[PDB]
Amino acid sequence: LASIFVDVSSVEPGVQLTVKFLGKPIFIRRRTEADIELGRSVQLGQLVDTNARNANIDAGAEATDQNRTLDEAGEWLVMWGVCTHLGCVPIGGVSGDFGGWFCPCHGSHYDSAGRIRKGPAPENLPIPLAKFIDETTIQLG
Ligand code: FES
């Protein structure tokens, strides 16, 4: 079956693990307390794309920070590392003007929940089918 199983036991706060799945990168960021608070400080009315783009929940869900992470605590942000403009790999480590990712191909800026805030990309980075299957492992697909 297509599903893969990622050991995240050694991922510390502020670290992103990048794994390849279905030929493309998936970003697994263990968010810092600043990342989480800032994501939770954005009003839906400020977003370019108000849809959560999240395979795990209703397709009409709002892009609240809570609807962008796997866990209620907001530490685990799992998303396709595929810019929604033309598919370049966004650069992380708190890059761009919104404390998230910056796609250098045509200048798209994503926030700390991977939501599009500036530039040509039309959508928030999509979230794959993903869930913890115990304390240390995320199943993708
Ligand atoms: S591919 Fe990311 S801004 Fe164009």
PDB file of C-alpha atoms and ligand atoms in Angstrom:
ATOM      1  CA  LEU A   1       0.000   0.000   0.000  1.00  0.00           C
ATOM      2  CA  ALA A   2       1.124   3.582  -0.568  1.00  0.00           C
ATOM      3  CA  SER A   3       1.216   4.690   3.079  1.00  0.00           C
ATOM      4  CA  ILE A   4       4.593   5.441   4.687  1.00  0.00           C
ATOM      5  CA  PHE A   5       5.535   5.750   8.362  1.00  0.00           C
ATOM      6  CA  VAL A   6       7.754   8.576   9.569  1.00  0.00           C
ATOM      7  CA  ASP A   7       9.633   8.484  12.870  1.00  0.00           C
ATOM      8  CA  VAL A   8       9.418  11.994  14.327  1.00  0.00           C
ATOM      9  CA  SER A   9      10.805  11.058  17.766  1.00  0.00           C
ATOM     10  CA  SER A  10      13.957  13.157  17.272  1.00  0.00           C
ATOM     11  CA  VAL A  11      12.330  16.279  15.795  1.00  0.00           C
ATOM     12  CA  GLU A  12      12.865  19.177  18.208  1.00  0.00           C
ATOM     13  CA  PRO A  13      10.938  22.460  18.346  1.00  0.00           C
ATOM     14  CA  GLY A  14      11.867  24.677  15.394  1.00  0.00           C
ATOM     15  CA  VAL A  15      12.998  21.768  13.222  1.00  0.00           C
ATOM     16  CA  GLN A  16      11.470  20.723   9.922  1.00  0.00           C
ATOM     17  CA  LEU A  17      11.909  17.164   8.668  1.00  0.00           C
ATOM     18  CA  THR A  18      11.435  16.792   4.899  1.00  0.00           C
ATOM     19  CA  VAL A  19      10.443  13.364   3.587  1.00  0.00           C
ATOM     20  CA  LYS A  20       9.669  12.336  -0.039  1.00  0.00           C
ATOM     21  CA  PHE A  21       6.214  10.845  -0.667  1.00  0.00           C
ATOM     22  CA  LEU A  22       4.518  10.228  -4.019  1.00  0.00           C
ATOM     23  CA  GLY A  23       7.604  11.790  -5.618  1.00  0.00           C
ATOM     24  CA  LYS A  24       7.365  15.142  -3.803  1.00  0.00           C
ATOM     25  CA  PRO A  25       8.506  16.653  -0.527  1.00  0.00           C
ATOM     26  CA  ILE A  26       6.330  16.676   2.578  1.00  0.00           C
ATOM     27  CA  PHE A  27       7.360  19.143   5.255  1.00  0.00           C
ATOM     28  CA  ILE A  28       6.911  18.049   8.887  1.00  0.00           C
ATOM     29  CA  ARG A  29       7.655  21.060  11.077  1.00  0.00           C
ATOM     30  CA  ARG A  30       7.593  20.843  14.849  1.00  0.00           C
ATOM     31  CA  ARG A  31       6.487  24.418  15.426  1.00  0.00           C
ATOM     32  CA  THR A  32       7.949  26.746  18.031  1.00  0.00           C
ATOM     33  CA  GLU A  33       5.768  28.534  20.569  1.00  0.00           C
ATOM     34  CA  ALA A  34       6.218  31.716  18.511  1.00  0.00           C
ATOM     35  CA  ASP A  35       5.118  29.913  15.320  1.00  0.00           C
ATOM     36  CA  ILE A  36       2.005  28.575  17.070  1.00  0.00           C
ATOM     37  CA  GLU A  37       0.995  31.841  18.729  1.00  0.00           C
ATOM     38  CA  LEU A  38       1.506  33.820  15.535  1.00  0.00           C
ATOM     39  CA  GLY A  39      -0.543  31.336  13.506  1.00  0.00           C
ATOM     40  CA  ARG A  40      -3.327  31.631  16.066  1.00  0.00           C
ATOM     41  CA  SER A  41      -3.212  35.434  15.931  1.00  0.00           C
ATOM     42  CA  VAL A  42      -4.342  35.694  12.290  1.00  0.00           C
ATOM     43  CA  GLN A  43      -8.014  36.418  11.603  1.00  0.00           C
ATOM     44  CA  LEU A  44      -9.686  34.518   8.749  1.00  0.00           C
ATOM     45  CA  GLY A  45     -10.510  37.870   7.135  1.00  0.00           C
ATOM     46  CA  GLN A  46      -6.795  38.577   6.700  1.00  0.00           C
ATOM     47  CA  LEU A  47      -6.134  35.416   4.655  1.00  0.00           C
ATOM     48  CA  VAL A  48      -5.800  35.141   0.895  1.00  0.00           C
ATOM     49  CA  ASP A  49      -7.180  31.566   1.053  1.00  0.00           C
ATOM     50  CA  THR A  50      -9.682  30.790   3.808  1.00  0.00           C
ATOM     51  CA  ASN A  51      -9.932  27.064   2.948  1.00  0.00           C
ATOM     52  CA  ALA A  52      -7.921  24.661   5.127  1.00  0.00           C
ATOM     53  CA  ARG A  53      -6.799  22.595   2.089  1.00  0.00           C
ATOM     54  CA  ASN A  54      -6.617  19.666   4.504  1.00  0.00           C
ATOM     55  CA  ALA A  55      -7.173  16.091   3.335  1.00  0.00           C
ATOM     56  CA  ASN A  56      -7.922  14.913   6.887  1.00  0.00           C
ATOM     57  CA  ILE A  57     -10.989  17.068   7.543  1.00  0.00           C
ATOM     58  CA  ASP A  58     -14.011  18.480   5.732  1.00  0.00           C
ATOM     59  CA  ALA A  59     -13.056  20.008   2.390  1.00  0.00           C
ATOM     60  CA  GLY A  60     -14.966  23.186   3.299  1.00  0.00           C
ATOM     61  CA  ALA A  61     -13.125  23.679   6.606  1.00  0.00           C
ATOM     62  CA  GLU A  62     -11.803  27.137   7.426  1.00  0.00           C
ATOM     63  CA  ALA A  63      -8.042  27.739   7.451  1.00  0.00           C
ATOM     64  CA  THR A  64      -7.837  28.444  11.170  1.00  0.00           C
ATOM     65  CA  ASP A  65      -4.491  27.513  12.695  1.00  0.00           C
ATOM     66  CA  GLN A  66      -6.215  24.635  14.482  1.00  0.00           C
ATOM     67  CA  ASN A  67      -7.391  23.226  11.127  1.00  0.00           C
ATOM     68  CA  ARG A  68      -3.825  23.326   9.789  1.00  0.00           C
ATOM     69  CA  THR A  69      -2.052  21.049  12.310  1.00  0.00           C
ATOM     70  CA  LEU A  70      -2.398  17.371  13.166  1.00  0.00           C
ATOM     71  CA  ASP A  71      -2.603  17.988  16.915  1.00  0.00           C
ATOM     72  CA  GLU A  72      -4.755  20.196  19.109  1.00  0.00           C
ATOM     73  CA  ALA A  73      -1.609  21.636  20.721  1.00  0.00           C
ATOM     74  CA  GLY A  74      -0.546  22.926  17.292  1.00  0.00           C
ATOM     75  CA  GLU A  75       2.998  21.562  17.384  1.00  0.00           C
ATOM     76  CA  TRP A  76       2.810  19.395  14.255  1.00  0.00           C
ATOM     77  CA  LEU A  77       2.451  21.103  10.887  1.00  0.00           C
ATOM     78  CA  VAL A  78       2.508  18.571   8.042  1.00  0.00           C
ATOM     79  CA  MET A  79       2.093  19.833   4.477  1.00  0.00           C
ATOM     80  CA  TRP A  80       3.118  19.231   0.893  1.00  0.00           C
ATOM     81  CA  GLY A  81       6.234  21.296   0.156  1.00  0.00           C
ATOM     82  CA  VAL A  82       4.787  22.241  -3.225  1.00  0.00           C
ATOM     83  CA  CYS A  83       4.096  25.907  -3.945  1.00  0.00           C
ATOM     84  CA  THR A  84       0.506  26.246  -5.145  1.00  0.00           C
ATOM     85  CA  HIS A  85       1.564  28.653  -7.898  1.00  0.00           C
ATOM     86  CA  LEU A  86       3.831  26.493 -10.103  1.00  0.00           C
ATOM     87  CA  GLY A  87       5.207  23.835  -7.767  1.00  0.00           C
ATOM     88  CA  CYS A  88       8.610  25.059  -6.599  1.00  0.00           C
ATOM     89  CA  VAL A  89       9.823  23.988  -3.151  1.00  0.00           C
ATOM     90  CA  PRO A  90       9.200  26.719  -0.559  1.00  0.00           C
ATOM     91  CA  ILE A  91      12.154  27.674   1.657  1.00  0.00           C
ATOM     92  CA  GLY A  92      11.512  27.362   5.397  1.00  0.00           C
ATOM     93  CA  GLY A  93      13.364  28.087   8.613  1.00  0.00           C
ATOM     94  CA  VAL A  94      11.092  31.103   9.189  1.00  0.00           C
ATOM     95  CA  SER A  95      11.560  32.713   5.772  1.00  0.00           C
ATOM     96  CA  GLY A  96       9.622  35.422   3.967  1.00  0.00           C
ATOM     97  CA  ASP A  97       7.604  38.298   5.406  1.00  0.00           C
ATOM     98  CA  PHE A  98       5.110  36.166   7.365  1.00  0.00           C
ATOM     99  CA  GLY A  99       7.358  33.994   9.540  1.00  0.00           C
ATOM    100  CA  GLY A 100       6.896  30.822   7.489  1.00  0.00           C
ATOM    101  CA  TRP A 101       8.075  29.891   4.008  1.00  0.00           C
ATOM    102  CA  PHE A 102       9.210  31.838   0.955  1.00  0.00           C
ATOM    103  CA  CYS A 103       8.950  30.464  -2.572  1.00  0.00           C
ATOM    104  CA  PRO A 104      11.759  32.128  -4.525  1.00  0.00           C
ATOM    105  CA  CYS A 105      10.520  31.151  -7.991  1.00  0.00           C
ATOM    106  CA  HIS A 106       8.015  34.032  -8.142  1.00  0.00           C
ATOM    107  CA  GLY A 107       7.933  35.384  -4.574  1.00  0.00           C
ATOM    108  CA  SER A 108       5.109  33.689  -2.691  1.00  0.00           C
ATOM    109  CA  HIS A 109       5.110  34.073   1.097  1.00  0.00           C
ATOM    110  CA  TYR A 110       3.433  31.570   3.414  1.00  0.00           C
ATOM    111  CA  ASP A 111       2.818  32.064   7.130  1.00  0.00           C
ATOM    112  CA  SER A 112       3.603  29.868  10.131  1.00  0.00           C
ATOM    113  CA  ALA A 113       0.614  27.640   9.327  1.00  0.00           C
ATOM    114  CA  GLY A 114       1.647  27.367   5.651  1.00  0.00           C
ATOM    115  CA  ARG A 115      -1.096  29.744   4.532  1.00  0.00           C
ATOM    116  CA  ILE A 116      -0.532  31.938   1.477  1.00  0.00           C
ATOM    117  CA  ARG A 117      -0.234  35.624   2.388  1.00  0.00           C
ATOM    118  CA  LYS A 118       1.527  37.395  -0.513  1.00  0.00           C
ATOM    119  CA  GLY A 119       2.553  36.668  -4.100  1.00  0.00           C
ATOM    120  CA  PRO A 120       1.052  34.793  -7.031  1.00  0.00           C
ATOM    121  CA  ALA A 121       0.201  31.472  -5.344  1.00  0.00           C
ATOM    122  CA  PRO A 122      -3.569  31.060  -5.016  1.00  0.00           C
ATOM    123  CA  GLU A 123      -3.794  28.530  -2.177  1.00  0.00           C
ATOM    124  CA  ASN A 124      -2.476  27.500   1.200  1.00  0.00           C
ATOM    125  CA  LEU A 125       0.014  24.611   1.026  1.00  0.00           C
ATOM    126  CA  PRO A 126      -2.133  21.464   1.040  1.00  0.00           C
ATOM    127  CA  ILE A 127      -2.094  19.017   3.941  1.00  0.00           C
ATOM    128  CA  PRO A 128      -1.768  15.300   3.113  1.00  0.00           C
ATOM    129  CA  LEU A 129      -3.585  12.411   4.716  1.00  0.00           C
ATOM    130  CA  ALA A 130      -1.548  12.214   7.914  1.00  0.00           C
ATOM    131  CA  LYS A 131      -2.031  11.065  11.498  1.00  0.00           C
ATOM    132  CA  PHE A 132      -0.036   9.942  14.494  1.00  0.00           C
ATOM    133  CA  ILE A 133      -0.294   6.191  15.039  1.00  0.00           C
ATOM    134  CA  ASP A 134       1.471   6.358  18.430  1.00  0.00           C
ATOM    135  CA  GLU A 135       3.668   8.909  20.199  1.00  0.00           C
ATOM    136  CA  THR A 136       6.533   8.849  17.706  1.00  0.00           C
ATOM    137  CA  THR A 137       5.226   8.038  14.231  1.00  0.00           C
ATOM    138  CA  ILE A 138       3.206   9.879  11.627  1.00  0.00           C
ATOM    139  CA  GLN A 139       1.537   7.778   8.952  1.00  0.00           C
ATOM    140  CA  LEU A 140       1.359   9.597   5.597  1.00  0.00           C
ATOM    141  CA  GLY A 141      -1.347   8.301   3.270  1.00  0.00           C
TER     142      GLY A 141
HETATM  143  S1  FES B   1       6.265  28.484  -7.944  1.00  0.00           S
HETATM  144 FE1  FES B   1       6.185  29.457  -5.965  1.00  0.00          FE
HETATM  145  S2  FES B   1       5.853  31.588  -6.387  1.00  0.00           S
HETATM  146 FE2  FES B   1       5.788  30.605  -8.370  1.00  0.00          FE
END
